[PDB]
Ligand binder design. Sequence first.
Ligand SMILES: Nc1nc2cc(Br)ccc2s1
Lengths: 215, 213
Amino acid sequence: SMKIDVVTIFPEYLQPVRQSLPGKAIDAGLVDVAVHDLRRWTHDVHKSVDDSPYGGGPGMVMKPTVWGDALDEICTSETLLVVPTPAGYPFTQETAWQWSTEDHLVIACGRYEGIDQRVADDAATRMRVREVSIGDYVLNGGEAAALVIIEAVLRLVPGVSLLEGPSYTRPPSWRGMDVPPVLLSGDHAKIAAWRAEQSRQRTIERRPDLLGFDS
Amino acid sequence: SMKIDVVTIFPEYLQPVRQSLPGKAIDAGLVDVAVHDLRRWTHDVHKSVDDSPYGGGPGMVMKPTVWGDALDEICTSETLLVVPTPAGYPFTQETAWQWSTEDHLVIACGRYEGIDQRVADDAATRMRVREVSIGDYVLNGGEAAALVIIEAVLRLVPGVLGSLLEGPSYTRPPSWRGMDVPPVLLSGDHAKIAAWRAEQSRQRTIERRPDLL
Ligand SMILES: Nc1nc2cc(Br)ccc2s1
């Protein structure tokens, strides 16, 4: 049984956890996902969570005070605090396997130009903290990255390289395009070999890095 | 003017997109996002969208006849068909910039075991097709990847959503739980601040992303 808490100023954006794979995992009781509005930990009537950056720069930075109070309430020393950010360590399949065995993930979703660095620094004095990037692109906030991380982790929880090549299903001919004959041949060895080859050939074309080549 | 059509068996998943859109952008006709339930194009009373893989193996493959009908209705010659898949070319910020000037994106969300490859192959004979991965991990389906792609692309379209790594950021208060904001940031020496930020970026990139150097 895993607990996932997500902290965000847009709790509505996390509603997709209730569908597909995470929804099934929740219904099966293998995971509990709770979404928290960060503004719950504010005290002004304006419910401010952001302020201008020290040292200059565009945009706003999320205040450490509000985050600190939120994480104080939600986290324990056993928590794995996950902070999605384009500046993070890469989140990979290996990371997903690692986190699949955790009792408690707390995902802090930033907005504006990110979260005051002291939030992660302070949290790291009492729990494990992981700032991670899900890919080399910029979002407006961490919420979609939280959903990706939850999807990647939950499908690996007990109870739930190379690129996969093309797959096919019925009918054997469609619009004049035939399924590769070897796949219809029932020869397990030949099919295995063809699939292995297709995998390695797609990998060299689409992801040469995976095989130790440039680009 | 960008139109995005998303096709999925989980249309409710894509609701945050529509909710993410400022009314000003919609009323100005800058953007339109539509979500379509793939089962609209099923043929049978059981609304079947997948079937066992030829050549054997685990999982299911999505049916070409269903997807072919859906894309025939939704796509035109001007469409950029986007297919999220862990087996794709990498989706990066450069991709997002490229796609931000497209008139029509159609995002085909399938299970990771895949859509029958003839769907993309057929589509590619009359439109541009891009099979892409958003990272080096497997998701059960393309829906969360579609959310990431939509957000990364649309935030680059003026007014729609409202190298080295970035270093740390700070705001008030100047001291919090025993930690002070780096005094250089309060120095009023803006050339020095820029140099300090450059070094913080260098250190963070070496530590977290040595591949970038
Ligand atoms: N690719 C990603 N972009 C962002 C932007 C913000 Br603001 C917060 C988290 C993330 S993860």
